[PDB]
């Protein structure tokens, strides 16, 4: 709960540009909202996928490395606390984010749309 708020604070601190400059790049990622007792393996998959998305060479180029490490640490901290169709829907959701980023050639506006999208879907998953 407190580690969830620190993840959102670091994602907001990672912001480089305003999404107002990228409104034409908005996209519906179709997050399966009503997936959040058996919430542990779904939330666990969500955190791992967020880590996977934000730990590629592309993410290293697009974001401040210092904030990215505190961000991985916070995602890891949440996995410590926690420790199949739902997992698949989450995996499909992150595939759509990756496909969008590839199609948009990892532009700063595509990255800002994805950062703001993760701000929403992460806060939804963590209530």
């Amino acid at each position, epitope marked *: 709960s407190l580690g969830s708020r620190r993840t959102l604070m670091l994602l907001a601190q990672m912001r480089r540009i305003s999404l*107002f*400059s990228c*409104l*034409k790049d*908005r996209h*519906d990622f179709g997050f399966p*909202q009503e997936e959040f007792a058996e919430t542990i393996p779904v939330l666990h998959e969500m955190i791992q996928q967020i880590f996977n998305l934000f730990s590629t060479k592309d993410s290293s180029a697009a974001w401040d490395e210092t904030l990215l490490d505190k961000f991985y640490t916070e995602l890891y901290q949440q996995l410590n606390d926690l420790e199949e169709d739902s997992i698949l829907a989450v995996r499909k959701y992150f595939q759509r984010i990756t496909l969008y980023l590839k199609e948009k050639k990892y532009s700063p506006c595509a990255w800002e749309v994805v950062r703001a999208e993760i*701000m929403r879907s992460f806060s939804l998953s963590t209530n």
Partner: single-chain antibody, 233 residues
Framework: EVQLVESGGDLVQPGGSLRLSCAAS????????MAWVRQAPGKEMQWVSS????????YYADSVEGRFTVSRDNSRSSLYLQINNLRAGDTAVYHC?????????????????WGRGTLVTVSSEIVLTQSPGTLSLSPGEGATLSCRAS???????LAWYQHRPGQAPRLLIY???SRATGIPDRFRGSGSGTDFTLTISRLEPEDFAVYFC??????????FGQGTKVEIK
């Protein structure tokens, strides 16, 4: 006492031009993205143009692209809309509005402050559907207003507004269920996907107004419902 005041509306010939102006008071104008939303007689609200806090970035509806030009003077707390090559479709009350979106979530496209508008009379997309058209109720009664979208509203970015006679439109709900600052608990937003509802649990005399919905999840244009009029009995 915080307001937006539009002026510059007039009778104008087809092919003519008008400069609309919007004066902002009670807030530091320079910190907000701004917008122009018009309403033709008998029609739903229509987003026209948006402009960034610094004026460097702007957006337009496709029908006004190249004919309209939005600008702003932050040192004067003024927003402008130059409207050229006017046609019969441009006859509308033009409202200026203050964007309620923030940078942390990037939830731009919805408005927490509006002006009463300035009439322009030219002398001769996701569709939202509201139901019912009119509700005739007595004070103390509840009301259930529906807003249906032609496709899924991305991120649940649905806003509800109240338009009381003689008053500027007012933001009630944003993000489909968050009450705006100052809005009483009797207004309750719910829903997701393509089906949204506004519940007014007890009607007060000031609650007799037109209530309209808006989706702002998409890339521009952001679109509005035609409204549900709630009248007294």
């Amino acid at each position: 006492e915080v307001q937006l005041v539009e002026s510059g509306g007039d009778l104008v010939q087809p092919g003519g031009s008008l400069r609309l102006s919007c004066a902002a008071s009670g807030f530091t104008f320079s910190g907000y993205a701004m917008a122009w939303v018009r309403q033709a007689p008998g029609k739903e609200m229509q987003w026209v143009s948006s402009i960034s806090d610094d004026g460097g970035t702007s957006y337009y509806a496709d029908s006004v692209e190249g004919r309209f030009t939005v600008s702003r003077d932050n040192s004067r707390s003024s927003l402008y809309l130059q409207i050229n090559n006017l046609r019969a479709g441009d006859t509308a009350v033009y409202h200026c509005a203050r964007d309620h979106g923030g940078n942390d979530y990037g939830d731009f496209g919805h408005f927490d402050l509006w002006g009463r508008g300035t009439l322009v009379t030219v002398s001769s997309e996701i569709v939202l559907t509201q139901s019912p058209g009119t509700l005739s109720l007595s004070p103390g009664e509840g009301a259930t207003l529906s807003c249906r979208a032609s496709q899924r509203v991305s991120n649940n970015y649905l806003a509800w507004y109240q338009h009381r006679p003689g008053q500027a439109p007012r933001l009630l709900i944003y993000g489909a269920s968050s009450r705006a600052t100052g809005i009483p608990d009797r207004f309750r937003g719910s829903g997701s996907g393509t089906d949204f509802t506004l519940t007014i649990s007890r009607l007060e005399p000031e609650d007799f107004a037109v209530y309209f919905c808006q989706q702002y999840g998409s890339a521009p244009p952001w679109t509005f419902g035609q409204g549900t009029k709630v009248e007294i009995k």
